[PDB]
Amino acid sequence: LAPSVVTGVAQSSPLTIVTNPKEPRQPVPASDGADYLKTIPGFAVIRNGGSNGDPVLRGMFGSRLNILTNGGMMLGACPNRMDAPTSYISPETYDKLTVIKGPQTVLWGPGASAGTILFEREPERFGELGSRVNASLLAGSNGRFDKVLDAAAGNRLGYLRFTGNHAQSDDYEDGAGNTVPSRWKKWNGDVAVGWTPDEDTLIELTAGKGDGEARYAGRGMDGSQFKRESLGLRFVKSNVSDVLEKVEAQVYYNYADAIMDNFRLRTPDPSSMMPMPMASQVDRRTLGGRLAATWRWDDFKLVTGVDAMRNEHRARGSKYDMMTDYYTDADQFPWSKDAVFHNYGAFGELTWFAAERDRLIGGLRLDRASVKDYRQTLKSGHMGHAMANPTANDTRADTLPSGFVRYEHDLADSPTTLYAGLGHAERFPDYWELFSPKRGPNGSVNAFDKIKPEKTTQLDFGLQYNGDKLQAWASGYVGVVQDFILFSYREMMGSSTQATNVDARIMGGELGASYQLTGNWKTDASLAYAWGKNSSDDRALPQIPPLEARFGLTYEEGDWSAGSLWRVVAPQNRIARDQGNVVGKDFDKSAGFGVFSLNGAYRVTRNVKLSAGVDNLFDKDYTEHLNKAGDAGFGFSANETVPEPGRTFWTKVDFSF
Numbered sequence: 227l228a229p230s231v232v233t234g235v236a237q238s239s240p241l242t243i244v245t246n247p248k249e250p251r252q253p254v255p256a257s258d259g260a261d262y263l264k265t266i267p268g269f270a271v272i273r274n275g276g277s278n279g280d281p282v283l284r285g286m287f288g289s290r291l292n293i294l295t296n297g298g299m300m301l302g303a304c305p306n307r308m309d310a311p312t313s314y315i316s317p318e319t320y321d322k323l324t325v326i327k328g329p330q331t332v333l334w335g336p337g338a339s340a341g342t343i344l345f346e347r348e349p350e351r352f353g354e355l356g357s358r359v360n361a362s363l364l365a366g367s368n369g370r371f372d373k374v375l376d377a378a379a380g381n382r383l384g385y386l387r388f389t390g391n392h393a394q395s396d397d398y399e400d401g402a403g404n405t406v407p408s409r410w411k412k413w414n415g416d417v418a419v420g421w422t423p424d425e426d427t428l429i430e431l432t433a434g435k436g437d438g439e440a441r442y443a444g445r446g447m448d449g450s451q452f453k454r455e456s457l458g459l460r461f462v463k464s465n466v467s468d469v470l471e472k473v474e475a476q477v478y479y480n481y482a483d484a485i486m487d488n489f490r491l492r493t494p495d496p497s498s499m500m501p502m503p504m505a506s507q508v509d510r511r512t513l514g515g516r517l518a519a520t521w522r523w524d525d526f527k528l529v530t531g532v533d534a535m536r537n538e539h540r541a542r543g544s545k546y547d548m549m550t551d552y553y554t555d556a557d558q559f560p561w562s563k564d565a566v567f568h569n570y571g572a573f574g575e576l577t578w579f580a581a582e583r584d585r586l587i588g589g590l591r592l593d594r595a596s597v598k599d600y601r602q603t604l605k606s607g608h609m610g611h612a613m614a615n616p617t618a619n620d621t622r623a624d625t626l627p628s629g630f631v632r633y634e635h636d637l638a639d640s641p642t643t644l645y646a647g648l649g650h651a652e653r654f655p656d657y658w659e660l661f662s663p664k665r666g667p668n669g670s671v672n673a674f675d676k677i678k679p680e681k682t683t684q685l686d687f688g689l690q691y692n693g694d695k696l697q698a699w700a701s702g703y704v705g706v707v708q709d710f711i712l713f714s715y716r717e718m719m720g721s722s723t724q725a726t727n728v729d730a731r732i733m734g735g736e737l738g739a740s741y742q743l744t745g746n747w748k749t750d751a752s753l754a755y756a757w758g759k760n761s762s763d764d765r766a767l768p769q770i771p772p773l774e775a776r777f778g779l780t781y782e783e784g785d786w787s788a789g790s791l792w793r794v795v796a797p798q799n800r801i802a803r804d805q806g807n808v809v810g811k812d813f814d815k816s817a818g819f820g821v822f823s824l825n826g827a828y829r830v831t832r833n834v835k836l837s838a839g840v841d842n843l844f845d846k847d848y849t850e851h852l853n854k855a856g857d858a859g860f861g862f863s864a865n866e867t868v869p870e871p872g873r874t875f876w877t878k879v880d881f882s883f
């Protein structure tokens with residue numbers, strides 16, 4: 227019951243991880259959902275700068291992970307992804323983080339070929355009048371301050387709750403003492419009044435605001451705003467009937483409003499392109515909903531339901547007077563909408579509790595996806611001159627069925643669990659894969675017209691051991707991807723992208739173990755590996771993270787613990803130069819490295835606990851393979867992968883009344 231700083235999370239269920247995001251973590255994470263995922267084998271991150279990095283599971287990027295917030299989808303607005311759905315997540319304000327790896331549920335949304343990611347606040351629960359409160363201040367290296375506060379009130383009949391937070395940091399320094407252009411600033415706020423007449427009933431109303439900024443070393447333009455709004459409603463009922471157990475119906479509305487410029491967080495680099503002040507305001511509106519009933523009756527259980535979603539994108543950008551010098555910011559011009567996405571689907575997950583020692587799970591879902599191209603001109607003539615968009619007001623759709631079957635079995639003698647499982651998944655294309663690139667497949671009108679859905683057929687096997695003193699888990703995967711969406715780069719003349727559809731093989735795994743040595747000594751270990759190949763070009767896939775290992779040693783006695791952790795990462799030699807995705811590209815083979823860190827935590831009293839840690843003790847100078855290239859407007863020669871941070875100190879008090 228001693229405290230602890232989190233250095234890793236073992237696999238709880240098969241293919242499932244469940245962590246508490248309110249616990250302190252060793253490589254101390256930004257106010258950002260991608261960072262609270264680094265602590266789970268299988269997860270790399272594209273560094274942009276301070277925060278707001280693009281998550282990556284088993285080498286797969288972007289929408290292939292289905293990243294949810296209270297069951298609802300929080301989508302970004304920028305066409306280059308400086309606001310991935312993680313950028314609007316501050317995980318501290320959430321109670322639970324589940325991750326389902328591989329395409330092994332149909333319950334939570336469409337076309338999660340790579341994996342599923344859940345951020346949940348669990349409903350408040352009282353009994354008599356009451357009031358909880360938790361708070362955490364956090365301070366460390368480089369002007370880093372994080373406040374966070376969660377607070378309830380209510381009784382048997384209802385409740386009210388306010389989570390919020392505020393975080394920020396200044397430009398950090400790398401291992402060679404450079405100042406990396408990468409501050410940030412963030413705040414969130416969320417009310418949640420909930421009504422609970424019988425103990426078999428619940429409604430919940432959720433309003434939220436949020437905003438933030440982020441300097442980006444990797445790009446020629448900074449986030450000076452990622453405003454958010456969010457309203458939503460959740461309805462659930464317990465035991466309608468001897469068979470019908472739950473009825474879950476809910477709605478969400480998530481609006482993302484994101485200004486992005488080159489003058490409010492930096493001076494415009496006159497040297498090359500964009501020597502002009504330029505803003506670009508963009509927004510993204512999301513409405514969607516979900517309805518599911520559950521039926522436990524026999525050695526059997528079944529979740530069937532439908533859901534649907536619609537989202538809308540609009541953009542508008544400054545113009546500069548090249549000759550009189552009268553900048554006119556982008557808000558004085560009309561919101562110019564450009565894309566609309568629709569989805570409707572119906573799903574089912576049937577579970578068979580054969581024996582104690584055998585389970586069977588099989589899920590199916592059918593989806594109907596649609597998108598309309600609302601852009602009338604396209605900025606892509608000569609010097610980007612206005613051209614007639616040959617897909618103006620067009621609209622395509624598709625009905626895309628996914629499914630899976632998983633077989634878990636518990637060995638007779640020892641606490642071991644084996645599991646194999648097959649799954650097939652189809653994903654309609656992204657905003658950024660349809661609209662962002664400047665060229666579609668090789669002989670086409672644009673990308674919207676020709677890019678094809680992505681079909682992934684993946685095999686997921688693995689095992690679990692829950693010993694008295696030894697815990698160990700293994701998850702592996704081998705699978706193939708049809709019409710994998712892929713980006714290609716080439717040198718007003720910046721760099722131009724071509725999205726194509728290629729055929730690709732993939733395979734990898736993760737594995738981990740922890741051993742309880744003495745009652746005070748604990749050692750833990752975790753390994754993570756990914757492999758991917760472009761089958762239709764006899765070449766490796768781009769942007770795959772190289773082999774990675776982490777070794778943990780901790781000591782604890784009743785009231786406190788301390789620990790140290792070892793991260794060693796192999797070099798990536800399989801690259802795909804000038805091929806990547808909408809945020810980034812493979813260019814150069816990466817260098818292995820290792821980085822050591824130290825943590826400790828100390829429980830003062832029932833209500834207050836204390837931890838602190840040191841990050842990258844020996845101040846290693848290193849950069850990670852996935853990280854972007856640096857602007858060269860901050861001093862970045864050629865394709866300089868944006869460096870990691872150096873040695874770093876942080877401390878954090880966790881209050882809990």
Ligand SMILES: [Cu+2]
Pocket residue numbers: 304305306307308447486
């Ligand atoms: Cu942007």
